[PDB]
Design a protein around this motif. Sequence first.
Motif, PDB file in Angstrom:
ATOM      1  N   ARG A 376       0.848  -1.178   0.000  1.00  0.00           N
ATOM      2  CA  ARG A 376       0.000   0.000   0.000  1.00  0.00           C
ATOM      3  C   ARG A 376       0.888   1.234   0.000  1.00  0.00           C
ATOM      4  O   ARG A 376       2.050   1.171   0.415  1.00  0.00           O
ATOM      5  CB  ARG A 376      -0.954   0.002   1.200  1.00  0.00           C
ATOM      6  N   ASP A 381       6.651   6.598   1.329  1.00  0.00           N
ATOM      7  CA  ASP A 381       7.257   7.596   2.198  1.00  0.00           C
ATOM      8  C   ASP A 381       8.073   6.939   3.297  1.00  0.00           C
ATOM      9  O   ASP A 381       9.102   7.482   3.716  1.00  0.00           O
ATOM     10  CB  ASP A 381       6.178   8.493   2.797  1.00  0.00           C
ATOM     11  N   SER A 382       7.638   5.773   3.773  1.00  0.00           N
ATOM     12  CA  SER A 382       8.451   5.035   4.735  1.00  0.00           C
ATOM     13  C   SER A 382       9.840   4.769   4.171  1.00  0.00           C
ATOM     14  O   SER A 382      10.855   4.996   4.839  1.00  0.00           O
ATOM     15  CB  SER A 382       7.777   3.718   5.098  1.00  0.00           C
ATOM     16  N   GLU A 385      11.981   7.852   3.939  1.00  0.00           N
ATOM     17  CA  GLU A 385      12.515   8.221   5.244  1.00  0.00           C
ATOM     18  C   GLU A 385      13.652   7.296   5.651  1.00  0.00           C
ATOM     19  O   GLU A 385      14.639   7.740   6.245  1.00  0.00           O
ATOM     20  CB  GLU A 385      11.408   8.192   6.291  1.00  0.00           C
ATOM     21  N   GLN A 389      17.446   8.291   6.480  1.00  0.00           N
ATOM     22  CA  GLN A 389      18.079   7.831   7.711  1.00  0.00           C
ATOM     23  C   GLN A 389      19.453   7.247   7.426  1.00  0.00           C
ATOM     24  O   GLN A 389      20.398   7.455   8.194  1.00  0.00           O
ATOM     25  CB  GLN A 389      17.208   6.777   8.386  1.00  0.00           C
TER      26      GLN A 389
END
Lengths: 428, 56
Positions: A376, A381-382, A385, A389
């Motif tokens: 999904r 965006d996960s 990020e 990181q």
Amino acid sequence: TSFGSLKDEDRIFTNLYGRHDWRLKGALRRGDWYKTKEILLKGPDWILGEMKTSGLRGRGGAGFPTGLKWSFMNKPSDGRPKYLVVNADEGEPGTCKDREIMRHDPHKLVEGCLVGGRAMGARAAYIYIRGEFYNEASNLQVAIREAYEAGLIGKNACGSDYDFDVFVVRGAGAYICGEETALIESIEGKQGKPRLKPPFPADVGVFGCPTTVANVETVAVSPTICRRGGTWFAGFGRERNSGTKLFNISGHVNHPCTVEEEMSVPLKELIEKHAGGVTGGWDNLLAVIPGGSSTPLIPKSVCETVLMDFDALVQAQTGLGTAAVIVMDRSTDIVKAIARLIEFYKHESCGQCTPCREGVDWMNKVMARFVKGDARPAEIDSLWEISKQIEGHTICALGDGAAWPVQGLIRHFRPELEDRMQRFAQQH
Amino acid sequence: ASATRVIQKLRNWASGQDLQAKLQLRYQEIAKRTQPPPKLPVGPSHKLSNNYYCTR
Ligand SMILES: Cc1cc2nc3c(=O)[nH]c(=O)nc-3n(C[C@H](O)[C@H](O)[C@H](O)COP(=O)(O)O)c2cc1C
Ligand code: SF4
């Protein structure tokens, strides 16, 4: 100026296609080993000033001014000797250039190692290559045999009293070893694992002895610079991007190729002039990889009209690296391509950094899900990020190498993924 | 409720109010037990991005 449009009289790495001989004889004919003795007389400072005037930058990875990289080591000695190392390794997908340089122009490489060691008051040069290149290491060792037996190397370098030595080394089939520090460690026998900067090899490193690292192309061109003038060289490039360059065009192309060219040249001109043209028709082109896996793609809107250099690529949000131009068209799963590109890293990450070891696999699994859309959206965006990181929170550039591709894929081609996902949901 | 009309009338005249409309006992005026398995929500903190703790 409209850069490029080069002359095969200024093109340096002659015998590239091996149409001539690669022995000492053909080399002397081509113009190798010319007044190297006078150079050794002139000494280091002149060579360093010549390179600085030329404004040369580095090929391997980001562009670090070689003049300064070597002035770091230009220094007296305290019993600790000083060594040079050559990063003949080549695993970065899309790079088939140092191998050619070696199997077709080894004498020039030896000449460059010698000049650099003289500049840094060295004692010897360790040329570290991979293991698969047994044929190349063999040809190079043979050329070195000839050089020793002649007298261009060893106790009496070329007529002076400079004692210099050359040694060759094979790895065992790794890629990370092509990093400025884990290279040294592999040489020493310790696992192919990097170190922390600081300290820097230019003051502390191999065998606890000061040393410098260099790429084959840089070391091979520095002598031609020194014996031609430097200013002439710089004239073939913009203020900062000075110099010629090697390119490797592969992928979706009529005729893949390895080429020599000028810097700050239009990518479109490059591809459509050599290579016999892009496959299936230009319009079928989708995006590019102008620096191998260590750089993110760019789509049509910038693949066209762009230049080619460290700057004006940075501006384009990317880097150059090895000039490994891959090209694709509207017939491939960009996602599958990039997922395999990331599984490459998941297989060839040493592992001692936590974010690398435990985020590269995260990325690989999430991209393997993206392949089929069994996910999904917000995972997008996960992943972005996660990349942000990883970027700076590691040791070797391989973290950025693993993040950047995803960053570009997700800044450019999100709707493809979204549609894959909706379509899979439709299919249940 | 099972009681008689006359007794309803009598108790109602006594009290003053009505009772069959506001009884205290419970004749199926409740929600059935054995309710169905429910599914629940979560907070605005179960996202995947822009949830860095340092903010909150
Ligand atoms: C992970 C990694 C892998 C690399 N692999 C190669 C390689 O296979 N061949 C190569 O010529 N350079 C490779 N490089 C470039 C190196 O950074 C380079 O040899 C050295 O670090 C810098 O030398 P330079 O400033 O003269 O370019 C690699 C760099 C990194 C970070
Ligand atoms: S970033 Fe990855 S490949 Fe580089 S040193 Fe750390 S663990 Fe090894």
